[PDB]
Amino acid sequence: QHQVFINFRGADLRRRFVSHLVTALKLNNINVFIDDYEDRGQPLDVLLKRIEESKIVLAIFSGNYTESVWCVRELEKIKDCTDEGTLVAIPIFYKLEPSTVRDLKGKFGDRFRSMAKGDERKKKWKEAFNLIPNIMGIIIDKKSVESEKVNEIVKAVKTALT
Numbered sequence: 001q002h003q004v005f006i007n008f009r010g011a012d013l014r015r016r017f018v019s020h021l022v023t024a025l026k027l028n029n030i031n032v033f034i035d036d037y038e039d040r041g042q043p044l045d046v047l048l049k050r051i052e053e054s055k056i057v058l059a060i061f062s063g064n065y066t067e068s069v070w071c072v073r074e075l076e077k078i079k080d081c082t083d084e085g086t087l088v089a090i091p092i093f094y095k096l097e098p099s100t101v102r103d104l105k106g107k108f109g110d111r112f113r114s115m116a117k118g119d120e121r122k123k124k125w126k127e128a129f130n131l132i133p134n135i136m137g138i139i140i141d142k143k144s145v146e147s148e149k150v151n152e153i154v155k156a157v158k159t160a161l162t
Contacts, residue, residue, distance in 0.1 A: 001031060001033075002031045002032055002033040002050070002053070002054060003030060003031050003032070003054065003055045003056060003161065004025060004030055004031070004032045004033070004054060004055070004056045004057070004058060004157060005032070005033050005035070005050055005051050005054040005056070005057045005058070006018065006021070006022070006032055006033065006034055006035055006057075006058045006060065007035050007051070007057055007058065007059045007060060007071070007074055007075070007078065008035055008037055008058075008059075008060035008061075008062065008065065008071075008094075009035070009037050009038075009039070009062065009064040009065050009067065009068050009071050010037060010062055010064040011037065011038055013037070013060070013062055013064070013094065014034070014037045014038075017094065017140070017146055017149075017150075018034075018037075018060070020146065020147070020150050021058075021150050021153060021154075022034065024150050024151070024154050025154060025157065028154055028158065030154075030157060030158075030161070033050050033054070035047070035071070035074070036070065039068050039070055039071075044070055044073065047070075047074060048073075048074065048077045051074060051077050051078060051081065051087070052077070052081060052086065052087070054087055055087060055088065055160070055161065056087065056088045056089075056090065056157055056160050056161065057078050057081075057087055057088070057089045057090070058090050058092055058153065058157070059075065059078055059089055059090070059091045059092065059132060060092040060094050061091065061092065061093055061094060061096060061101050061108070062094040062095065062096065062108075063095070063096065063106075063107045063108055063111070064111075065108065066104075066108055066109070066111040066112035066115060067111045067114075067115055068115070069115055069116075069119075072112075072115070072116075072125050072128075075125075075128050075129070075132065076124065076125065076128055078128075078132070079128045079131065079132055082132075082135070088160045089132065089135055090135070090137055090138065090153070090156055090157070090160070091132055091133055091135055091137030091138075092137060092138050092140065092153065093137060093138070093139045093140065093141075094140050095140060095141065095142060096108055097139070097141075098133040098137065098139070099133075101129055101132070101133050102129065102130050102133045103130075104126065104129060112125075112129070138152050138153055138156065
C-alpha cells in the first residue's frame with residue numbers, strides 16, 4: 001500500500017517538519033508509511049518488512065535518531081536493502097551535517113555511544129552510519145526555509161518514483 005517509508009525518531013519532529021512533509025507527499029498522491037517514531041513497541045519484524053516492501057526510504061537523521069536501538073536496526077536494514085539494490089534511500093539531515101552522521105559527532109554521536117555501550121553490534125552500526133551518507137541527500141540546517149526543503153524532498157521522491 002505504501003511507496004515511501006519515512007524513517008525517523010521524535011514526537012516533536014513528527015508533529016512539526018514531518019507533518020508538513022507527509023501532507024505534501026499525500027497532496028502529490030504519494031503513499032507513505034510512518035516509522036515507530038516514539039518506540040511504542042511496534043514489532044520490529046513488521047517495521048523491517050515495511051521497509052523492504054518500500055520503493056523509497058527517507059532516512060531522516062536527527063539528534064534523537066541514535067537514542068533508539070530499534071531505529072538503528074532499521075538503518076541496518078535500510079543499508080542492506082540499498083546495497084542489494086531492492087530500494088532507493090534518501091538521507092535527510094535534519095539540523096545536523098552529513099559529517100556529524102558519518103563521524104558520529106555531537107549529541108547525535110554521544111547518544112549513539114550511550115545506547116550502544118557493550119553491544120556487539122556496535123561496529124556494524126558505526127559502519128552503516130559511516131556509509132549511508134555516501135548517498136546524496138538533502139540537508140535542512142538551522143537557516144533553511146522548511147517549506148522549500150519539503151518541496152526539495154518531494155521533487156526527489158517523484159524523480160526516484162519515475
